[PDB]
């Protein structure tokens, strides 16, 4: 009999990911602070890492990896970038740590374009300002806008693309084939309205299935060419960049973690990263498909009883 | 990457190696202390004597 | 040396205590006359604990036996090992107790106490280093009940900083002698709340249904009662008796089973229970059943409650490795049963030296608030009768009022009271 | 030559203390009997083995050591083990009854009736020095003479010795292998009243030693005797630099000057490797650079954290056996690239390195192999902050019901005492997210 903790009522995932483990018999629920257990579906903030794997004779399992913050925080994102010879990078927008610091490289790289697209984005509450004035007025980051978007018709509309990815105990990188773009139901505006930076499709969001056939129809071209790779070089990228900070491999304990990984993809084809969510959630259809997937790969692979593309490294 | 004071004898070596640079309670109260615990133990047998002998 | 002092009154406490130390002087190597005759030095590196090494290598248990008539001592005297006994330490009187609380605690018994009290000064005198006393006796007589509590309180009196341990038989209609056991059993507990540190619940009717329901055995007797007990005696016991590193001595033992002073009655449990049989049992055979209520003696469902601490022992060679993987699994398949603000609450410790005749075994040492079912089951029996003043008059005969009654009813129900508060917390 | 006297306190103390003074003698070739052939300062000398080590007419090397325990037994094994020539009366203390795991009785009860005597030993032992440099206290968490006595004699040791440096070695609890429940309890008692009077203790973990044992020596159930010798390898090598000729650590208050910036903080953690069990007839003998990388394991490490997640305030690399500074360079700007190494932004990011040729010295048959290289790294991370927090929480799940509590009461400690000790904890822990926390 394996045994688990819930410690994030609030979490749409590991409430199904929960209810499928007692669907199968083989899994008790603890109480919240019942210290012997197999798995923990820990909270999202201060989670007490310093506690698990000393339990004597008990494998113990948690649904996040420590340090994996410093990917999923706006603000520590940038600095992770810049500051990581892995990452140095074209598939990021030109981003600045400014506090309310980069402040004064900021204005060098702006100016230099005002005097030459010079529209910005900042957030962390959002302004897009094509000056610098209240943008600065306005921790946050200040991000290039893409103001060359590629736009689906009919609708003349933006989007941004979901992807999930599953990383193991083992620091195996799978991508759920299954993701979703979250389209903007208004026509983009090239002239402060914030509403287009279920009309055409259920939802607001399209999946890979729909997204994949008007590629082909209107660009002559797939998903996987035009994007996909990108999409899977951006997600080794980043996570194989923080492997040694935040790998499980000879600890104590062991960590697996959800990732939701947000781009964006310009009139060019080109995928960029936007940012990465640590605890996302699921479209709707794709709850109990990737629930079972992470009960698979994640965690019956460690207390034994592809809907995923593995990211070899 | 700097070695410094480095220090040789017959039976090793030692040195530092930079990769950066940067950015009581007296006598009397312990006996005070220990004494007050005594009696409160002291105390604690008393009454219990006295629960006892009732 | 640690020395350790037994005592043991009446007839059930006597004839348990005769057979537990029938039981550890043949593991210890100690024959019927106080020779030794072991074969491994193990049996002799703390048998100071309970014997007293006389002239001639003899060694002589550390015991006093205690009774208000002579029946049952005369049977020791001309029992198995009953010459091993130091015969000043016979202390007994004529009259009996009736099966009477208030002559064995305020007439009877008080005629005798001082001249055991003198048998206890010379042994405590001669020891090196006391650690403390244990009794073996019933609550549902007089003597054992009213005597053996009288006798506690007077050991206290003189030995505040002493452990004082008891092996106390709880009364059960189902194996019963009067009916007023559940008078003299309600008495004896709020004695023993005060003036115990550990105290191992014993009941008549669990040691039945064991010998009935698992051994097969189709009438049982007191005798083979006494000798489930004595065993599980031996085995609470070896912690002390063997070098080892857990309980090792009656304080330590009882800083890490009792968190809170009055909860100190534990409900222990022996394995293997097997009826007539050769085979070799095994680790998880031996835990299994060890943790099943049907070979736990206090006929409380653990399932019922929640433990607050848990001794686990081993005897015979065995694989710790194994042991631990058990004992580790038991708790995970238990969550529920374990209080989750005592971290650690379940200690196991192994012995090498096993009882005679089996090559493995095992003994459980529980403080579970299931506990308070017993003290319930004697205090709905109690007020049955006291209701009515049944059989009153044989108690304001020696004295008593109805006031110490009501008291001890309100005592027995507060005791109660604070198990519930822990099971729910 | 300044000296240093070694106190060791209950049951772990001195079972640790008996097996650190086996490989003592067996580093410095003094035999059972206390001769040592190589000595030809025959009945004195100040050389570097002096300061542990003092010598008599008769030729004999006798221990500057002092065993306490308020039990008979265990110290009965020091007066009849191999070794038992090397000491005289005067330096054994026993009682006759224990602390029964239980911090006030060990402090309050039996501490206040014994303390004199035990001081009265260390002040013999002291009288011989021409220059005390100071006390190492080895000592467990658990016991409850380990905790208990022991703060009360570290409070006395200031007072009687202002001056002095004192250095613990301090085994903390692990349910593997501990057998009271109270002893997260007796942690915090004891680490609250010694913590203005440590200046280093360096903490050992018996659940890391205990996993050190099962995975590299293959054992499957430990024995105090396995655990023993494998932590005295840890003490010899942090104490090889009092003891032999050398340049790094090479008096007491180089511990603090070179670990502890922050005196609260002064918990440095401990790596070893490597262990190697002595059944493999033929290992590969790790380089330098792979027992230098292996200093970044958590699994080499004498507390289970991990130091990634916390900043370091100051590293010590203590060699022993066939390494030169060459290799240790190479190795560090190796792992410097491929490890997550932050420092403190008010701390140099640096390493002190000392080398002693002699590789280290097993027990003949032992079960620990003899390595041609090995090192122990000392470092000051906050990381080790962990298992001030594993200890914390355990503490405050019993103290909110009040369990146990009133063993301490009626030893005459004040309930006041336990919030009190909890509260400095919970200062302690502030300090360390203070100081590792961006
Ligand atoms: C009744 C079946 C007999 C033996 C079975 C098979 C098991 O024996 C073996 N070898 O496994 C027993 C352990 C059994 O489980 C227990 C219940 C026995 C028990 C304590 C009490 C019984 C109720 C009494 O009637 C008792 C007078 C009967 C027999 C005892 O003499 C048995 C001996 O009791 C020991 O204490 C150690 C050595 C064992 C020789
Ligand atoms: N590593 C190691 N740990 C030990 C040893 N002996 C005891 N311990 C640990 O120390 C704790 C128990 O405290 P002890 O040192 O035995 O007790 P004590 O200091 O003698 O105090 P009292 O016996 O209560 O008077 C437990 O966590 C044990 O696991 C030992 O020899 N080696
Ligand atoms: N540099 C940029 N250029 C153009 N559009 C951008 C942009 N950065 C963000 N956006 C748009 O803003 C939207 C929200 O941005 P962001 O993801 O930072 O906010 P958020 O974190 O609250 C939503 P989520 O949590 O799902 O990622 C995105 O859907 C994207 O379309
Ligand atoms: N297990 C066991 N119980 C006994 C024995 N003798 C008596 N009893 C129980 O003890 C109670 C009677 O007490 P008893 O010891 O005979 O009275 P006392 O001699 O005055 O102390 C009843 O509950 C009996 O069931 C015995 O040998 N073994
Ligand atoms: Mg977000
Ligand atoms: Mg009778
Ligand atoms: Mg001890």
Sequence with gaps: ?313 | ?54 | MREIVHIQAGQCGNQIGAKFWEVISDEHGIDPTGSYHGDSDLQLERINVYYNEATGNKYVPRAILVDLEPGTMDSVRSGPFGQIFRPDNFVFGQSGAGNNWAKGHYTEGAELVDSVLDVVRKESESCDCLQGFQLTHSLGGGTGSGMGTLLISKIREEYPDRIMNTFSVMPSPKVSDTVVEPYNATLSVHQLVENTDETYCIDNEALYDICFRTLKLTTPTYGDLNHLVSATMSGVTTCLRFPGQLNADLRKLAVNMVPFPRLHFFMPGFAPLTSRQYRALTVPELTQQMFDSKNMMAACDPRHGRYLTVAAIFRGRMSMKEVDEQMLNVQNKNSSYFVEWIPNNVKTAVCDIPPRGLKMSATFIGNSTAIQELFKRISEQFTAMFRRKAFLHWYTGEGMDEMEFTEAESNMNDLVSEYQQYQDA | MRECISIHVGQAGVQIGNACWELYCLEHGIQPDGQMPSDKTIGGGDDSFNTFFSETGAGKHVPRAVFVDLEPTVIDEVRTGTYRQLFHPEQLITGKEDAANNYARGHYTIGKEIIDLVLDRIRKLADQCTGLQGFLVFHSFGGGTGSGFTSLLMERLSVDYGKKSKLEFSIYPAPQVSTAVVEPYNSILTTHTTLEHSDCAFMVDNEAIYDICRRNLDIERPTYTNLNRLISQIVSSITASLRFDGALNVDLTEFQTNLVPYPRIHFPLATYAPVISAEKAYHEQLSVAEITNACFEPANQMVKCDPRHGKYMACCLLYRGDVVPKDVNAAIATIKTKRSIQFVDWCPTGFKVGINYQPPTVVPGGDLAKVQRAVCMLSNTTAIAEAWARLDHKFDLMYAKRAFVHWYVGEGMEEGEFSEAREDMAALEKDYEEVGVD
Aim: proline share 4%.
């Design chain 2, 1 to 54: 990457m700097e070695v410094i004071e480095l220090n040789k004898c017959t039976s090793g070596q030692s040195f530092e190696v930079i990769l950066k640079p940067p950015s009581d309670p007296s006598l009397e109260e312990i006996q005070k202390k220990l004494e007050a615990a005594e009696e409160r133990r002291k105390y604690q047998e008393a009454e219990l004597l006295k629960h006892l002998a009732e």
């Design chain 1, 1 to 313: 009999m394996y045994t688990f903790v819930v410690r994030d009522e609030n979490s749409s995932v590991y409430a199904e990911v929960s209810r499928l483990l007692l669907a199968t018999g083989q899994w008790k629920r603890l109480r919240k602070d019942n210290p012997r257990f197999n798995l923990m579906l820990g909270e999202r903030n201060r989670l007490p890492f310093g506690r698990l794997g000393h339990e004597p004779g008990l494998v113990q399992l948690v649904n996040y990896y420590r340090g994996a913050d410093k990917l999923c925080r706006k603000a520590s994102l940038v600095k992770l970038i810049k500051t990581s010879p892995e990452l140095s990078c074209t598939w990021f927008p030109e981003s600045y740590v400014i506090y309310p610091d980069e402040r004064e490289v900021f204005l060098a790289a702006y100016n230099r374009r005002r005097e030459g697209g010079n529209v910005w984005i900042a957030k962390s509450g959002i302004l897009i300002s094509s000056e610098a004035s209240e943008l600065l007025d306005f921790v946050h980051v200040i991000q290039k806008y893409l103001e060359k978007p590629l736009l689906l018709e009919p609708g003349h509309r933006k989007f941004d693309i979901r992807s999930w990815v599953l990383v193991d105990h083992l620091y195996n990188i799978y991508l759920y084939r299954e993701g979703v773009l979250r389209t903007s139901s208004e026509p983009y505006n090239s002239a402060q309205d914030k509403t287009c930076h279920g009309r055409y499709e259920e939802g607001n969001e399209m999946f890979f299935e729909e997204f994949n056939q008007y590629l082909m129809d209107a660009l002559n071209t797939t998903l996987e060419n035009s994007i996909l790779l990108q999409i899977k070089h951006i997600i080794r990228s980043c996570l194989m960049c923080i492997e040694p900070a935040i790998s499980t491999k000879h600890l104590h304990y062991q960590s697996f973690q959800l990732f939701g990984f947000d781009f964006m993809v310009d009139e060019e084809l080109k995928v960029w990263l936007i940012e990465v969510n640590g605890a996302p959630a699921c479209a709707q259809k794709l709850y109990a498909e990737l629930c079972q997937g992470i009960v698979d790969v994640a965690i019956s692979s460690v207390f034994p009883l592809s809907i995923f593309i593995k990211l070899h490294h």
